[PDB]
Coordinates of C-alpha atoms and ligand atoms in Angstrom, one line a residue:
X1 CA 0.0 0.0 0.0
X2 CA 3.0 2.3 -0.7
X3 CA 0.7 5.2 -1.7
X4 CA -0.6 5.4 1.9
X5 CA 2.9 4.9 3.6
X6 CA 4.0 8.0 5.6
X7 CA 0.8 9.8 5.1
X8 CA 0.8 11.3 8.7
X9 CA 2.7 14.4 9.9
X10 CA 2.8 16.2 13.2
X11 CA 4.9 17.9 15.8
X12 CA 5.7 16.4 19.2
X13 CA 2.9 16.9 21.6
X14 CA 0.6 18.3 18.9
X15 CA -1.0 15.1 17.5
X16 CA -0.9 13.1 14.2
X17 CA -2.9 14.3 11.2
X18 CA -3.7 13.3 7.7
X19 CA -4.5 15.4 4.8
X20 CA -8.2 15.2 3.6
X21 CA -10.3 17.0 1.1
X22 CA -13.8 18.3 1.5
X23 CA -16.5 19.7 -0.9
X24 CA -16.5 20.3 -4.7
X25 CA -14.1 21.5 -5.9
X26 CA -12.0 19.9 -3.1
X27 CA -10.9 22.0 -0.1
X28 CA -7.7 20.7 1.5
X29 CA -7.5 20.4 5.3
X30 CA -5.1 18.7 7.8
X31 CA -7.1 16.5 10.1
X32 CA -6.1 15.0 13.4
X33 CA -6.5 11.2 13.5
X34 CA -8.4 10.1 16.7
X35 CA -9.4 6.6 17.6
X36 CA -10.9 7.8 20.8
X37 CA -13.9 9.7 19.4
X38 CA -16.4 9.3 16.5
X39 CA -17.1 12.7 14.9
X40 CA -15.6 14.2 11.9
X41 CA -15.4 17.9 12.7
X42 CA -13.5 20.8 11.0
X43 CA -12.9 24.5 11.5
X44 CA -15.5 26.4 9.5
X45 CA -14.9 30.0 10.5
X46 CA -11.7 32.1 10.6
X47 CA -10.5 31.3 14.1
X48 CA -7.1 33.1 14.1
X49 CA -5.0 30.0 15.0
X50 CA -6.2 28.2 11.9
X51 CA -4.2 28.0 8.7
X52 CA -7.5 27.3 6.9
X53 CA -11.1 26.2 7.3
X54 CA -13.9 24.6 5.5
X55 CA -15.8 27.3 3.6
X56 CA -19.2 25.7 3.0
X57 CA -20.4 28.4 0.6
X58 CA -17.7 27.3 -2.0
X59 CA -19.0 23.7 -2.3
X60 CA -21.9 22.6 -4.6
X61 CA -22.1 19.2 -2.9
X62 CA -22.6 20.7 0.6
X63 CA -26.0 19.9 2.1
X64 CA -27.2 21.4 5.4
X65 CA -28.8 19.0 8.0
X66 CA -30.1 22.0 10.0
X67 CA -29.0 20.7 13.4
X68 CA -26.3 21.7 15.9
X69 CA -23.7 19.8 18.0
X70 CA -22.0 20.8 21.2
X71 CA -19.0 18.7 22.3
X72 CA -17.4 19.5 25.7
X73 CA -14.1 17.9 26.4
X74 CA -12.3 17.4 29.7
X75 CA -10.8 20.9 28.9
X76 CA -11.5 21.1 25.1
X77 CA -14.9 22.3 23.9
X78 CA -16.4 22.8 20.5
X79 CA -19.7 23.6 18.9
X80 CA -20.7 23.2 15.2
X81 CA -23.3 22.8 12.4
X82 CA -24.0 19.5 10.9
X83 CA -24.1 18.9 7.2
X84 CA -22.8 16.4 4.7
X85 CA -20.4 16.8 1.9
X86 CA -18.0 14.9 -0.4
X87 CA -14.9 13.6 1.4
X88 CA -11.7 12.2 0.1
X89 CA -8.2 11.3 1.3
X90 CA -5.5 12.1 -1.2
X91 CA -3.0 9.6 0.3
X92 CA -5.7 7.0 1.0
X93 CA -7.9 4.9 -1.3
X94 CA -8.9 6.6 -4.6
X95 CA -12.6 7.1 -3.6
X96 CA -14.9 9.9 -2.4
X97 CA -17.7 9.5 0.0
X98 CA -20.5 11.6 1.4
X99 CA -19.9 11.8 5.1
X100 CA -21.3 13.7 8.0
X101 CA -19.3 17.0 8.8
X102 CA -19.6 19.2 11.9
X103 CA -18.7 22.6 10.7
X104 CA -17.0 24.0 13.8
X105 CA -18.3 27.5 14.3
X106 CA -17.1 28.1 17.9
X107 CA -14.6 26.5 20.1
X108 CA -12.7 26.8 23.4
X109 CA -9.4 25.2 24.1
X110 CA -9.8 22.7 21.3
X111 CA -7.4 24.1 18.6
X112 CA -3.8 24.4 19.4
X113 CA -2.2 27.8 18.6
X114 CA 0.7 27.1 16.3
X115 CA -0.5 23.7 15.0
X116 CA -1.0 22.7 11.5
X117 CA -4.3 21.0 11.8
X118 CA -7.9 22.3 11.4
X119 CA -10.0 19.3 12.2
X120 CA -10.5 16.0 13.9
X121 CA -11.4 12.6 12.3
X122 CA -13.1 10.4 14.9
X123 CA -12.5 6.8 14.1
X124 CA -14.5 5.0 16.8
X125 CA -18.1 3.9 16.7
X126 CA -21.6 5.4 16.3
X127 CA -22.4 4.6 19.8
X128 CA -20.3 7.5 21.1
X129 CA -20.9 9.8 18.1
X130 CA -22.4 13.2 19.0
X131 CA -25.2 14.3 19.2
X132 CA -26.1 10.5 19.2
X133 CA -25.7 7.1 17.5
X134 CA -27.7 8.2 14.5
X135 CA -24.9 10.4 13.3
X136 CA -22.9 7.9 11.2
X137 CA -19.1 8.2 11.6
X138 CA -16.7 8.7 8.7
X139 CA -15.2 5.2 8.5
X140 CA -18.7 3.6 8.6
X141 CA -19.7 5.8 5.6
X142 CA -16.5 4.9 3.9
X143 CA -17.2 1.2 4.2
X144 CA -20.9 1.2 3.5
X145 CA -20.3 3.2 0.2
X146 CA -17.3 1.7 -1.3
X147 CA -15.3 -1.5 -1.7
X148 CA -12.8 -0.4 1.0
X149 CA -12.5 -3.3 3.5
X150 CA -13.6 -2.7 7.1
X151 CA -10.2 -2.1 8.6
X152 CA -7.4 0.3 9.1
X153 CA -4.0 0.3 10.8
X154 CA -1.8 2.9 12.3
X155 CA 1.9 3.3 12.7
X156 CA 2.5 6.4 14.8
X157 CA 6.3 7.2 14.6
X158 CA 7.4 9.3 17.5
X159 CA 8.6 16.6 14.2
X160 CA 6.5 13.3 14.0
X161 CA 5.3 11.1 11.1
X162 CA 3.6 7.8 10.5
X163 CA 1.2 5.8 8.5
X164 CA -2.6 5.3 8.3
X165 CA -3.2 2.4 6.0
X166 CA -6.9 2.6 5.2
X167 CA -8.4 -0.7 4.1
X168 CA -5.5 -3.0 4.9
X169 CA -2.1 -3.7 6.4
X170 CA 1.4 -3.0 5.0
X171 CA 4.0 -5.6 6.2
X172 CA 6.8 -3.1 5.7
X173 CA 5.7 -1.3 8.9
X174 CA 6.2 -3.9 11.5
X175 CA 8.3 -6.9 12.4
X176 CA 7.6 -10.3 13.8
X177 CA 4.1 -11.4 14.3
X178 CA 0.8 -9.7 14.8
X179 CA -1.0 -10.6 18.0
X180 CA -4.7 -10.0 18.4
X181 CA -7.0 -8.9 21.3
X182 CA -10.8 -8.8 20.9
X183 CA -12.7 -5.6 20.8
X184 CA -14.8 -6.0 23.9
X185 CA -17.6 -3.9 22.5
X186 CA -17.9 -1.5 19.6
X187 CA -18.1 2.0 21.1
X188 CA -14.6 3.1 21.8
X189 CA -11.9 0.5 20.9
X190 CA -12.3 -1.3 24.2
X191 CA -10.0 -4.1 25.1
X192 CA -9.3 -6.1 28.3
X193 CA -5.9 -6.0 30.1
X194 CA -5.3 -9.1 32.1
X195 CA -1.9 -8.5 33.7
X196 CA 0.6 -5.7 34.2
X197 CA 4.2 -6.1 35.0
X198 CA 6.9 -3.6 35.6
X199 CA 10.3 -4.8 34.6
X200 CA 8.8 -8.2 34.9
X201 CA 7.3 -7.7 38.4
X202 CA 3.6 -8.4 38.5
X203 CA 1.7 -5.7 40.4
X204 CA -0.4 -8.6 41.5
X205 CA -3.6 -6.6 41.6
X206 CA -7.0 -7.8 40.8
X207 CA -7.2 -7.7 37.0
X208 CA -10.7 -6.0 37.2
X209 CA -8.6 -3.0 38.5
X210 CA -6.7 -2.7 35.2
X211 CA -9.9 -2.1 33.3
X212 CA -11.9 0.1 35.8
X213 CA -14.0 1.2 34.2
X214 CA -12.7 0.9 30.7
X215 CA -9.5 0.0 28.8
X216 CA -9.2 1.7 25.4
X217 CA -6.9 2.4 22.5
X218 CA -6.8 6.1 21.6
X219 CA -4.5 7.9 19.1
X220 CA -6.0 11.2 20.2
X221 CA -4.6 11.1 23.7
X222 CA -0.9 11.5 24.4
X223 CA -0.5 9.4 27.6
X224 CA -0.9 6.0 29.0
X225 CA -3.5 6.9 31.5
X226 CA -4.0 4.3 34.4
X227 CA -7.1 4.0 36.7
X228 CA -6.9 5.7 40.1
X229 CA -6.3 2.5 42.1
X230 CA -3.9 1.1 39.4
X231 CA -2.1 4.4 38.9
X232 CA -1.2 4.4 42.7
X233 CA 0.4 1.0 42.5
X234 CA 2.1 1.4 39.1
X235 CA 3.5 4.6 40.5
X236 CA 4.8 3.0 43.8
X237 CA 6.6 0.3 41.8
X238 CA 8.0 2.5 39.0
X239 CA 9.0 5.0 41.6
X240 CA 10.6 2.1 43.5
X241 CA 12.6 0.7 40.5
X242 CA 13.7 4.3 39.8
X243 CA 14.9 5.2 43.3
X244 CA 18.6 5.5 42.1
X245 CA 17.6 9.2 41.7
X246 CA 14.9 11.1 43.5
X247 CA 12.5 13.4 41.8
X248 CA 9.9 15.9 43.0
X249 CA 6.8 14.0 44.2
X250 CA 4.8 16.3 41.8
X251 CA 7.0 15.5 38.8
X252 CA 5.4 12.1 39.0
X253 CA 3.1 14.0 36.9
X254 CA 1.7 16.1 35.7
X255 CA 2.7 18.8 38.2
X256 CA 6.3 19.3 37.0
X257 CA 8.9 18.6 34.3
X258 CA 12.2 16.9 35.0
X259 CA 15.6 17.6 33.5
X260 CA 19.1 16.1 32.7
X261 CA 21.9 17.7 30.6
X262 CA 21.3 16.6 26.9
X263 CA 22.6 12.9 26.7
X264 CA 22.5 12.7 30.6
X265 CA 18.9 11.3 30.4
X266 CA 19.0 8.5 33.0
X267 CA 17.3 5.8 30.7
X268 CA 17.7 2.7 32.8
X269 CA 16.7 3.6 36.4
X270 CA 13.4 3.1 34.5
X271 CA 11.6 -0.2 33.9
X272 CA 10.2 -1.5 30.7
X273 CA 6.4 -1.8 31.1
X274 CA 4.1 -4.7 30.1
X275 CA 0.5 -5.2 29.5
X276 CA -0.9 -8.6 29.0
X277 CA -3.9 -8.5 26.7
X278 CA -6.8 -11.0 26.4
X279 CA -5.9 -13.3 23.4
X280 CA -8.0 -14.8 20.7
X281 CA -8.3 -18.2 22.4
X282 CA -9.7 -19.3 25.8
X283 CA -7.2 -19.0 28.5
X284 CA -4.6 -17.5 26.1
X285 CA -3.0 -14.1 26.3
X286 CA 0.0 -12.1 25.0
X287 CA 2.1 -9.1 26.0
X288 CA 3.1 -5.8 24.8
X289 CA 6.2 -4.2 26.3
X290 CA 7.3 -0.5 26.0
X291 CA 10.4 1.5 26.9
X292 CA 10.8 4.5 29.3
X293 CA 11.6 6.1 25.9
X294 CA 8.0 5.7 25.0
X295 CA 6.6 7.1 28.3
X296 CA 9.3 9.8 28.8
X297 CA 8.2 12.6 26.4
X298 CA 10.6 15.4 25.2
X299 CA 8.9 18.7 26.1
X300 CA 18.6 21.2 28.8
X301 CA 16.6 17.9 28.0
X302 CA 13.3 18.3 30.1
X303 CA 10.9 15.4 29.9
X304 CA 7.4 14.8 31.0
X305 CA 5.8 11.8 32.7
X306 CA 3.4 10.2 30.3
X307 CA 1.5 8.0 32.7
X308 CA -1.5 9.3 34.7
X309 CA -4.8 8.8 36.4
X310 CA -8.3 8.5 35.2
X311 CA -11.7 8.1 36.5
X312 CA -12.2 7.2 32.9
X313 CA -10.4 3.8 32.8
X314 CA -7.1 2.9 31.1
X315 CA -6.2 4.9 28.0
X316 CA -3.6 3.4 25.8
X317 CA -2.6 6.7 24.2
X318 CA 0.2 7.4 21.9
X319 CA 2.7 6.4 24.7
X320 CA 1.6 2.9 23.8
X321 CA 0.8 3.3 20.2
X322 CA 4.3 4.7 19.3
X323 CA 5.8 1.3 20.0
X324 CA 3.6 -0.7 17.8
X325 CA 1.8 -1.1 14.5
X326 CA -1.8 -1.2 15.6
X327 CA -4.4 -2.8 13.3
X328 CA -8.0 -2.0 13.9
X329 CA -9.6 -5.0 12.4
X330 CA -13.2 -3.9 12.7
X331 CA -14.3 -6.7 10.3
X332 CA -13.2 -9.4 12.8
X333 CA -14.0 -7.3 15.8
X334 CA -10.3 -7.4 17.1
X335 CA -7.1 -5.3 17.4
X336 CA -3.7 -6.5 16.5
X337 CA -0.3 -5.4 17.7
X338 CA 3.2 -5.9 16.2
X339 CA 6.5 -4.4 17.0
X340 CA 6.8 -1.2 15.0
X341 CA 9.5 -0.7 12.3
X342 CA 9.8 3.0 13.4
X343 CA 9.7 3.0 17.2
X344 CA 12.5 4.7 19.2
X345 CA 14.8 1.9 20.5
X346 CA 18.2 2.0 22.3
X347 CA 20.7 -0.8 22.0
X348 CA 20.2 -2.4 25.5
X349 CA 16.3 -3.0 25.3
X350 CA 13.5 -2.7 22.6
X351 CA 9.7 -2.8 22.5
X352 CA 8.2 -6.3 22.1
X353 CA 5.0 -8.2 21.4
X354 CA 5.1 -11.9 22.6
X355 CA 3.0 -14.9 23.3
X356 CA 1.3 -17.2 23.9
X357 CA 0.8 -17.0 27.6
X358 CA -1.6 -19.1 29.7
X359 CA -4.0 -16.9 31.9
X360 CA -7.1 -18.0 33.6
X361 CA -10.4 -16.2 34.4
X362 CA -9.8 -13.5 31.8
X363 CA -13.5 -12.9 31.4
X364 CA -13.4 -11.8 35.2
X365 CA -11.1 -8.9 34.1
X366 CA -13.8 -7.0 32.3
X367 CA -15.4 -4.5 34.7
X368 CA -19.2 -4.8 34.5
Ligands
5HA1 C1 -3.2 16.6 20.6 C2 -2.5 15.8 21.7 N1 -3.5 15.3 22.6 C3 -3.3 15.6 23.8 O1 -2.2 15.9 24.1 C4 -4.3 15.1 24.7 C5 -5.6 15.0 24.2 C6 -6.7 14.5 25.0 C7 -8.1 14.3 24.4 O2 -9.1 14.2 25.1 N2 -8.1 13.8 23.1 C8 -9.4 13.6 22.4 C9 -9.3 14.1 21.0 C10 -8.6 15.5 21.0 C11 -7.4 15.7 20.4 C12 -6.8 17.0 20.3 C13 -7.4 18.1 20.8 C14 -8.7 17.9 21.4 C15 -9.3 16.6 21.5 C16 -9.8 12.2 22.4 O3 -11.0 12.0 21.7 C17 -10.0 11.8 23.9 N3 -10.7 10.5 23.9 C18 -11.1 10.2 25.3 C19 -12.7 10.3 25.4 C20 -11.9 8.9 25.4 C21 -6.4 14.1 26.3 C22 -5.1 14.2 26.8 N4 -5.0 13.7 28.1 C23 -5.9 14.2 29.1 S1 -3.5 13.4 28.7 C24 -2.8 14.8 29.4 O4 -3.9 12.4 29.8 O5 -2.5 12.8 27.7 C25 -4.0 14.6 26.0 C26 -1.8 14.5 21.1 C27 -0.4 14.6 20.9 C28 0.3 13.5 20.4 C29 -0.4 12.4 20.0 C30 -1.7 12.3 20.1 C31 -2.5 13.4 20.7
CL2 CL1 -24.1 9.7 4.8

């Protein structure tokens, strides 16, 4: 699928986007790729931060749906006007579909001043689509209206780059074997984590903990976010493996940045981290392992701590995704992980995907 290879750009900390076109003739926009949301939504007014925006009056295929949408985030809020128009992805399959568009007419703390994107492509399911499940998401319009197979894969390469392969997989982007975890239910890309090790040390928690109340795969979130009760323990252990050097008790966020002279970065006082994921077969699991490199983000070389808490559940943000090629195999209701060809890896230890493991009572790990 060489046409689609390297079709993502970005800057550290500012997200991964793909170029799309909207309306007739096409208007070109950069659009953030987010697997943790389900609306396609673009700037539609001259917000000053925006390099460009969808100008509906210039498109003959635009059709008004005469309905509004209001999407608060955690911090990031937008409001827009629903319509539909002709959408296409230059570095994607050679098709065009009529999809839903939320013309963003007002927003607070959503756009990033200095970024080079103007929109968001929500790749999750109708169930979490705003205003409600009737608003069909982009990918579902894609598949229903063309021959494009019901699947996509992401390689996010941590100025950033990567690939979104729409409709398939490209073997050039990973090594070894793909391992697959079921999508527990189609709303977010929900999965079940069944064991967590730090440096190989289990945290011997109840595994219902690791998924309280969700575990999810989300390209639109920077961090590995862990549930309150899990975050606490994770922290204690990673803080314990790391006690060669002290650090502010607030830096284990969040609340500060940490620093070492460039090259002085203390890589190894940090443990690799492992999530075991439910496998395809009863009582079988597999693990994904990431480096401190993945969860220590460049912001003198000052890094942030990419793990954090959530009353939301686990969020396998880009901290996770950067180590792997992730295949969203909607057709078979499963997600696949393979070691990424582009992940950042030193010479002492690299990211890994391995199995099979035996693990009992995996069903018991799904919070209900
Ligand atoms: C842009 C940046 N995202 C961020 O840096 C960032 C974004 C979000 C955020 O909420 N992202 C949105 C999409 C969304 C995307 C962009 C703007 C608004 C909404 C996404 O739909 C969230 N999905 C959750 C509802 C399940 C959340 C956080 N976390 C709270 S955090 C501090 O724990 O990591 C960080 C980023 C950087 C690199 C890679 C990916 C994303
Ligand atoms: Cl439609």
